[PDB]
Design a protein around this ligand. Sequence first.
Ligand SMILES: *C/C=C1/C(=C/c2[nH]c(/C=C3[NH+]=C(/C=C4\NC(=O)C(C=C)=C4C)C(C)=C\3CCC(=O)O)c(CCC(=O)O)c2C)NC(=O)[C@H]1C
Ligand SMILES: *C/C=C1/C(=C/c2[nH]c(/C=C3[NH+]=C(/C=C4\NC(=O)C(C=C)=C4C)C(C)=C\3CCC(=O)O)c(CCC(=O)O)c2C)NC(=O)[C@H]1C
Lengths: 457, 462
Amino acid sequence: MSRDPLPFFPPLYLGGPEITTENCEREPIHIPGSIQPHGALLTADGHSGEVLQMSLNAATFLGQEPTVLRGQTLAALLPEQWPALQAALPPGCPDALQYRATLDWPAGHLSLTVHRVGELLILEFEPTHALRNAMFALESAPNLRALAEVATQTVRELTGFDRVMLYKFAPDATGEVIAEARREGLHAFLGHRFPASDIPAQARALYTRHLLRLTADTRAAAVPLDPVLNPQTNAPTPLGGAVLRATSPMHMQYLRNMGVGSSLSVSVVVGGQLWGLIACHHQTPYVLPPDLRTTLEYLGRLLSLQVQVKEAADVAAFRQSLREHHARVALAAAHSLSPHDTLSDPALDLLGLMRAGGLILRFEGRWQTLGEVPPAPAVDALLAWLETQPGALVQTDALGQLWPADLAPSAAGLLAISVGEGWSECLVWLRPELAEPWHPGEIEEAQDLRDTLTGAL
Amino acid sequence: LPFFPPLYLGGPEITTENCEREPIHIPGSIQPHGALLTADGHSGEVLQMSLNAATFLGQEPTVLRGQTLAALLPEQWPALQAALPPGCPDALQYRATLDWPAGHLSLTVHRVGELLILEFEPTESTGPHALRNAMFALESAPNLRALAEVATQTVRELTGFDRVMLYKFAPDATGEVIAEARREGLHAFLGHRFPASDIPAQARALYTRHLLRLTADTRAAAVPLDPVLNPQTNAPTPLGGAVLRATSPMHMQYLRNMGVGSSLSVSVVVGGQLWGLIACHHQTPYVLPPDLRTTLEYLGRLLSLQVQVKEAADVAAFRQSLREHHARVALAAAHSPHDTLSDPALDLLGLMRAGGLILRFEGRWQTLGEVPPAPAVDALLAWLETQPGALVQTDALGQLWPAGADLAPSAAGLLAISVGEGWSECLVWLRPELRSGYAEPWHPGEIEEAQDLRDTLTGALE
Ligand SMILES: *C/C=C1/C(=C/c2[nH]c(/C=C3[NH+]=C(/C=C4\NC(=O)C(C=C)=C4C)C(C)=C\3CCC(=O)O)c(CCC(=O)O)c2C)NC(=O)[C@H]1C
Ligand SMILES: *C/C=C1/C(=C/c2[nH]c(/C=C3[NH+]=C(/C=C4\NC(=O)C(C=C)=C4C)C(C)=C\3CCC(=O)O)c(CCC(=O)O)c2C)NC(=O)[C@H]1C
């Protein structure tokens, strides 16, 4: 889930491998060299504004002759916008930043979206309060599930989409539909789980930076960029920040198998990490208007923050229940005439403090244990390994990977603190293999215990 | 003690002595840049109208009253009932655009009790999308101060307002301008502190529920509702959820003293509590368009969450630098509280950057540092006993506790925690007045540190 994606294969127009379920992660979805036909795309030099590339539908769509359009400057094409465009998108700005305008064209009202990648401007053209009311229901939501339900119902009312889901990522990057608003007659996805590869790592990475993407018509063929390569670089044009970017054929096929005619998702990003997706399906082709997409992008940002805040409160609520327990222990440690007698007291329940299966206590050149632990030789080896570790805290949810593993029945997870320096005196909490991850609160609680014990002893 | 009656019910004239009792939610009047109707929730019979309704709606108030929303708004009336069902929150709004002989007309409707309130104002996505672009700068902001600066700069670019401030409330409801974006030439309010009464309790309460309010023209007279009382109840019409609500005259005077021609603020609400305000000033009258107001309401919601997150990070960063000291204190508390907590080695004074400290335990008290004399301490402790909860904190003890204003040399700022219930045992950190009546504000990290101390001591002593 946090892993960097494997490096991309070349695209099909550069003779790249055919994409299968075995090589999902390596499809270069960001450089399809093509767009969706409900809009037109130009690329232009960031300095001169010379038009370098155009989609093959762009001449017809803008009503200019191909030869005339290619080579023209944005000064000539977009005299009113060109000045504002340069100011809004200065060199080195993020590629997610966008200049947007509304044009009159000989095709009525036309939406223009511009963004910058490297030395290249990418211009996308396409034809062109209920949220405010849902904000109360969003704020009121007493938990993540309730919030998910409100979000999906809200988005469905906004868009008219036949299905709207909140898809939540597990730490292994598998997903679960935790909420769903759907048209009567459709079978429910609610509660269904899906493998990591249904949204592969390069997609999840892309979706952490570019927060909305869509397929307007799942039966429509992509329109190529001409030339397909960027003349500046003689390399593929990055289209990750372009909403008109052509969708992965693999995914479009998957959509068609689901009888989905149109699709849209918005990223839910929490702590720089992709938490989930607002996933929308329509049975029929549907170009969602640009202004409504803006609304969904806003909803995504709001929901992201609501999750971050709610999760922070769960953490704080959990850590509060470790202070009461910690106080009991600090009290005992203050009076202690021997850490062995005090800390091994079942009444103190140092096991339960960390939701551990086992605990090793070493003090005064001897150790003892509570709960399920490895046998004495394994404990001795564990302690000998610990001595080699720098710092005063070691924590792992898979001891095997860090310390190559046979202790996994009782000691798959490990959390150890030095009570002083050198690990001559220490506590080691152990957890069995499924280990259940140490909560960040349990880690800080261990740090607090280190201080307390270091002082008291 | 209750709100005073409004002026049209012969209520007291509002002064600096009786601020908190002005019923700002029932002024029985609106701002003249729009029109307001009220109507029965069931029948849609028009019950009240602003005396200017005629300019906006084309018809005379007397003529319009008695007609139904079915007759007046045939297209919207069906949708209006569905959007605002009985018992819905009063913050919920139906909105529409109407065609009128003169561009268009913006209609905003909301429901209070058995009453629908309809607001009409003239109207004509640059703003919504300009917000989208600012979201990156908001997310990027590395701390609360930087976030505050981005927020104010963003709002100023959206609106064109001459000044945009982020006003943060202390827990005693005193405030500080923690960020400011202003036109060239204006003197800065940044860092200035203001007493609780500049935004009084009933205003702050209203602002926790209704998140945007404005004064379009600070020299323009409010337009009365006719009749002023609600025929349903023979009582004042709640206008708290109406953006056209007339502004408190006291506040409008304050705005004029500041050379403010137009004012708008958005509530920053964090944990159901008013955290602060995005406060906007224009030197000249300015009706912000309805669509831009919608944008600001959205920004306020977003910023509320961004503030909570960014502020939590500042607190954690601050408390990390106090961990060694905190541990020392927790260790000592785990072991007579008088002997332990008075120990200079613990330095409970320095923990909170305090000048003084009162320790009450076992029916006696003692002090460290600069403190008031015994009778003042006894009075302070007696006042504390009357306070609800287990934490009292103030950066200006005088404003909250007027009899304690004379303690300002040693006790301008106060932070007190109960170690039992009822304040029989407590700690009181004191700070001197700044070299008026304000002490250096308590950092939110020092507050949570105090809460942690409370828990530890409460547990250890029981
Ligand atoms: C070889 C890899 C495969 C693959 C590729 C793939 N998938 C996406 C994007 C999406 N896949 C989604 C999956 C689901 N949609 C649903 O409705 C459900 C279940 C109810 C699932 C699991 C979703 C939501 C997306 C996001 C895009 C969207 O909103 O429509 C991509 C990237 C698409 C692009 O941006 O170009 C790729 C390459 N899909 C597979 O199933 C595996 C075999
Ligand atoms: C004795 C009465 C007083 C009084 C009452 C009062 N104040 C408000 C509302 C506001 N006061 C604000 C204060 C400030 N604006 C600034 O620019 C600064 C500092 C530079 C401060 C301290 C603000 C921002 C508001 C909100 C309204 C707005 O956004 O303009 C009310 C309620 C107004 C209403 O909603 O009807 C009342 C009754 N304020 C005083 O200062 C004293 C004179």
